[PDB]
Amino acid sequence: GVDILHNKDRKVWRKEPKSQDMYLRLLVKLYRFLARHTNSTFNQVVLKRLFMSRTKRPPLSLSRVIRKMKLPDRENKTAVVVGTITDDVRVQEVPKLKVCALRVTSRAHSRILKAEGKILTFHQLALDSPKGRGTVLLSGPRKGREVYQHFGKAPGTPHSHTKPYVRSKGRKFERARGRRASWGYKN
Amino acid sequence: PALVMSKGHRIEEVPELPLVVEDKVEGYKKTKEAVLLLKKLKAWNDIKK
Amino acid sequence: SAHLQWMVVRNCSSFLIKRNKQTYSTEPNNLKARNSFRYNGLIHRKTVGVEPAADGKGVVVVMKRRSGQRKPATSYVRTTINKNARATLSSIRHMIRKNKYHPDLRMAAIRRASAILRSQKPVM
Amino acid sequence: ACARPLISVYSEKGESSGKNVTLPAVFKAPIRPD
Amino acid sequence: PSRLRKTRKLRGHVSHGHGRIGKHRKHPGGRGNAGGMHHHRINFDKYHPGYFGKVGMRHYHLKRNQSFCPTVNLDKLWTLVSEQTRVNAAKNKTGAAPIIDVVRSGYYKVLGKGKLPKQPVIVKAKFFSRRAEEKIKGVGGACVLVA
Amino acid sequence: MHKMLNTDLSRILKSPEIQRALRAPRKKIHRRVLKKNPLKNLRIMLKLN
Amino acid sequence: NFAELKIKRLRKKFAQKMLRKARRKLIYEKAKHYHKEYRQMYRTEIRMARMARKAGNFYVPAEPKLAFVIRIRGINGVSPKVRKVLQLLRLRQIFNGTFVKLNKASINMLRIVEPYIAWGYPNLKSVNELIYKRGYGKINKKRIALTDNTLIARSLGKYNIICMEDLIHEIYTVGKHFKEANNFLWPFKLSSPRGGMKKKTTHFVEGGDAGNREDQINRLIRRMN
Amino acid sequence: APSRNGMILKPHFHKDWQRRVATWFNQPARKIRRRKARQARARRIAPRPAAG
RNA sequence: GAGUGGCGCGGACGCUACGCCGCGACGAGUAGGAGGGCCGCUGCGGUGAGCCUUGAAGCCUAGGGCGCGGGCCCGGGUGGAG
RNA sequence: CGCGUCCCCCGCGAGCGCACGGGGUCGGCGGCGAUGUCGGCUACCCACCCGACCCGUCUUGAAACACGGACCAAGGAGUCUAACACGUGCGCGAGUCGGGGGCUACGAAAGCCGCCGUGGCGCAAUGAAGGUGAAGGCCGGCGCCGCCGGCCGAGGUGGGAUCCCGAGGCCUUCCAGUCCGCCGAGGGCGCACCACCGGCCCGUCUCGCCCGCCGCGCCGGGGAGGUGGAGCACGAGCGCACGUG
RNA sequence: UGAAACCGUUAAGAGGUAAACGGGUGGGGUCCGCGCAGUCCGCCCGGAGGAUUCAACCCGGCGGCGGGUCCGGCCGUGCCGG
């Protein structure tokens, strides 16, 4: 007998990973304890990121992890990725880095251990640094994916630089009418 | 051997879990040799199951 | 390791017996006989088990030895206690406390042992 | 882990002969029921 | 998997999840890409602009092999050779430039997107961009052409 | 490659490195309290005023 | 050694006890002060009205600061402007109550939800009765009963409102932190009027039980509390 | 009838296509018969190269 | 918090962590949408050292109960091979 | 309700007990008891009080003088294939994939090939096209050179989860004090992401000035300022499986 | 094997608002509790019986931990040498 709208009574975020991966599930068990029993905010951020889908924990490039750890105060601090660390082949110099990440690709391992760099795991990060003291938490480019070009205004709206879904691309595949003032119109 | 026993394989008498046997197991030619080998390695109670 | 090969056998084991909103496990060293990370008799390095004796009278206390655990023929040490009710339980309390061998299974082992002795005791 | 213990090798009479093979790293691969 | 589907939870429900006021009738807006310029005009104009009409010249017999020209950039140029060559090229003191045959790697043209690491190199490509060439003069190198 | 190398969180969560950097448990349960009308109930009115 | 250890723990416990007794004494002496403040407040208007009548002039007293608003009508068939103002007052249910302090802004908000509320100027007794019997705090957005003073002290410690007598003083004598003490109090879930209403639909002036009931709101507070 | 933003498709299924569906259950018996005929030939032209 | 100076052999329950526990507010609903089913049907891979001629399926029942419900489990009868 | 000490006026006593005290207990009782009685709600039959129109469907509106339905059992209706999009799980990752081919009972399965990746999709766009095809300042010599060179070099602003430094402080009868752990004034590095301003690439327009040579010409290259692009600005893709459209 | 519709007969009950239905009881049946002198569980006390019976100390075999840091082995998503 009270005027509430129940539209927004439920919250639609993740409390657990969808994955039935046991090793991921033991990391989540390990970091639920640290999120609860420390006044560290690092463990709360890392736990939340352990739940997120592959399209939400993207692959961090090696060159982003070189650049964001060569910055002014990031000296002998641990580079923490919740996703994966993919090798960048266009970079020539790799400094000594201390990396903790879920996945690391075979090329980026052999590359980072070639220098004096050390590669951790999250069970090691807990024993090494429980509160996340002396860490730089990094994310990969989340609007990197092809899918985002097609999003926003409708392609065929004035000032919409949106990629439409065409079968193939040529001269006769969606180039004619609303793309040139020669043929009818243009926005 | 916690995972193997949870499958229901009756292996509480196998001396080792890997049970890496000799290489002259492959030279055998009778089912009397094959059962007698499983008796001596104490894997027989899985065949009885 | 314990937590690893729990996440494999917690739902998909031979011993698991689900019916009537109740979940037991018919494991040879489970005591309290239920699906748990504690009482599971196969997972851990250290395991205590209480059985009725080979004959009628007595109990058998089973201690899983530290050393060789992929070695199932020599993994378990069995001892028998055919004494009075108090001196049977006192031996079990002295095997579990004074070796610091699963002190959380002390009280559960004494309750199980007492139930085995009360079972093999005649009806009027 | 990186513990590769020393697995024994049994005779045809079911007794541990002195011959030993080191447990290959295949058995330490991450066990994935999924 | 027929168990995980929506059909199995419409058993009991009358319309099977297609409405009561407007039914599930057969083809109530025509078949396929019909009504393009008439009653599906807004969908085509809004999400598929430039669909109708003619643009450009018709090339009757077109063979795709004559217009075959796979590109590489200066970014990934040193990856067609070993890391051994790059290391030993700096380790050598004579000033000898290692030779990168681009057509052996399966690229004809070299484009100039990339920063180049500072040592001399020869590039035996079939084509070259202007900025691509300039950057290899900038690093102190050659541009040999291939027929 | 393993996603976590050491899968013994039995050992890990009681190891001195982790146990050092924790906050104390809040293990006391606080059930609801029955509201006693302190205008009728003298002592509760004394507990407040 | 441990003789030292338990001696230190015993000292720290005794320190915590004497800190409790010191705070408790402050609650007693503030309640004794507020009693003295209320009696001299009460005497003054009788004095000022007497000395006015002795001269032969009039004493117009202060137009009251505090209002008590009761929602009398329900959720069904209600205008959107009347909806927004009713949920800005937090009267989201029939027979809910809140205190609102009178200014220029709040009176012009009251008169546009007029047929849905029965409001007036409360008594010291009514303010005592409501906050002691129906007193619930909005602690962690959870409606928790004010059984102790360590709820009010832990929530409203910053504004120097450390007990129930402080809360009742800041409500009654419309002080500085009325906003943070009124918004602390969860809206008062009153009963149905025992003895019935006169008529819900119409104004108080024309027989009914809606609109401004100046000093007569205290009678409605007794029957619903 | 088009719903929203989505690719504009032209499926080539306007003819009687169900009559001319060619299914590959032959494949592992086709591979066996080829390997058979291959070894048969390789034995036939006995000391000559198997490739020809 | 930590250092250097001025007799009796004892102690309930717990923690399927996908578990267990605590506090507060809420609960109409057609078309429609999602979740959870230890709701049910028929077949395949595993598994229950399952059940069964000392009586399987099936069927009948003023018998005994469980579950919010889908349904289900026991008793008695018939039946004869799963 | 101690004085031994800090002002303007005149830090640990000891017990025992009662309880309007973080939700009910009795250290109170009394009957009746083997074929005639005790319990058994649900379930068979019946009675009485209150309520109570017959389902399905289309409809603004159905109990309808709207249509379908006499009764019962068995059958009986969103499926499979191709395509696309988005979410989701898994594997590898600037890659990825043998699907066609070949090799050596279950099994027409599984295993393997790499000088079987042809090839597909991806890592480059834009133009109808011929085509072209993705960052720079400064410091000298030639208040200037087309350049000879030399050093360093993938932008800026604002907001930004975390991280970093630390003015001071966290006790037991004090005073210094050393080591770890902890709080915090204020101040910095700034992830992803968003908004804005720069810039680079292709098309096309306006204005103008210099450079090159086995081929001096209706040859080729270059600059500044707007402007059109499904672009670049240190990659996210591919394959498999599931879900909805 | 022998379902339901529908029918015959036997038993029980009922019957003027067509029947049937939900809620609340009361009345009678049908079987059930294999009902009908009524709970077991600790320790102690109070009497009475029995048994070859504790604590300690020898001899043996097995197990746990830590031997803070003994002696010898094997492993290393460890590293430095030849």
Please render the helix and strand layout as text.
The structure is cut from a larger assembly and holds one copy of chain A (187 residues), three copies of chain B, one copy of chain C (124 residues), one copy of chain E (147 residues), one copy of chain G (225 residues) and one copy of chain H (52 residues).
Chain A: H1 22-37, H2 42-51, E1 59-61, H3 62-67, E2 78-81, E3 84-86, E4 98-100, E5 103-104, H4 106-112, E6 118-120, H5 122-128, E7 135-138
Parallel strand pairs in A: 1-3, 2-4, 2-7, 3-5, 4-6
Helix pairs in contact in A: 1-2
Chain B: H1 2-5, H2 31-40, H3 44-48
Chain G: H1 3-55, E1 66-71, H2 80-88, E2 96-101, H3 107-110, E3 117-120, H4 124-133, E4 136-139, E5 142-145, H5 152-155, H6 164-172, H7 178-182, E6 188-189, E7 211-212, H8 217-224
Parallel strand pairs in G: 3-7
Antiparallel strand pairs in G: 1-2, 1-3, 2-6, 4-5
Chain A binds three RNA strands through helix 1, helix 2, strand 1, helix 3 and helix 4.
Characterization of this structure:
This is part of a larger assembly, with 1 copy of chain A (187 residues), 3 copies of chain B, 1 copy of chain C (124 residues), 1 copy of chain E (147 residues), 1 copy of chain G (225 residues) and 1 copy of chain H (52 residues). Chain A is of the alpha/beta class and 187 residues long. Chain A has helices spanning 22-37, 42-51, 62-67, 106-112, 122-128, and strands at 59-61, 78-81, 84-86, 98-100, 103-104, 118-120, 135-138. Chain A is flat and about 70 Å long. Classes of the chains: A alpha/beta (187), B mainly alpha (49), C alpha+beta (124), E alpha/beta (147), G alpha+beta (225), H mainly alpha (52). Chains in contact: A-C, A-D, A-E, A-F, A-G, A-H, B-C, B-D, C-D, C-F, D-F, E-H, F-G. The A-F interface holds A 21, 23-24, 26-27, 29-30, 33-34, 37-39, 102-104, 109, 121-124, 126-128, 130-131 and F 1-7, 9, 12-13, 15, 17-18, 20-23, 25. The structure holds 3 RNA strands. Chain B: It is found in: Cytoplasm. Chain B: Belongs to the universal ribosomal protein uL4 family. Chain B: Component of the large ribosomal subunit. May bind IPO9 with low affinity. Interacts with RBM3.
